[PDB]
Design a binder for this molecule. Structure first.
Ligand SMILES: Cc1[nH]c(-c2cccc(N)c2)c2c1C(=O)CCCC2
Length: 127
């Protein structure tokens, strides 16, 4: 069994900028979710080999995790906040696609997503 290569966190050909919204996403949003008790399944890519999930990457074609997001934010990978928000929503969506309602992992994603939504509600004005 085989995992795919993880999502890229560096791309010198990709335009990039530092914005106050992106710093908020690192310093407030990512920090809030990273320290949560339910964060650990989401801090790195899903290892479908060790987890014995050979169908994971057959179903999930856009994997995403907070470890990748953290490195992308720290490496200034993004152009705008929307790109980073999309990555967060992709990671939650993957969890809901692959798992059953009521699975513990879904309850964990749900709790993180609630905090995510509470924090992005106060995303500062782009300035
Ligand atoms: C998001 C997610 N994370 C992890 C996991 C579990 C233990 C260790 C590591 N690194 C990752 C899983 C998962 C799923 O969606 C499928 C359900 C269980 C596996």
């Amino acid at each position: 069994s085989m995992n795919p290569p993880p999502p890229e966190t560096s791309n010198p050909n990709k335009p990039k900028r530092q914005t106050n919204q992106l710093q908020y996403l690192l310093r407030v949003v990512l920090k809030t979710l990273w320290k949560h008790q339910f964060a650990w399944p989401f801090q790195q890519p899903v290892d479908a080999v060790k987890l014995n999930l050979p169908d994971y990457y057959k179903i999930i074609k856009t994997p995403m995790d907070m470890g990748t997001i953290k490195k992308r934010l720290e490496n200034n990978y993004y152009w705008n906040a929307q790109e980073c928000i999309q990555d967060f929503n992709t990671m939650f969506t993957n969890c809901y696609i692959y798992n059953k309602p009521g699975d513990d992992i879904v309850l964990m994603a749900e709790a993180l997503e609630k905090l995510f939504l509470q924090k992005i509600n106060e995303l500062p004005t782009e300035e």
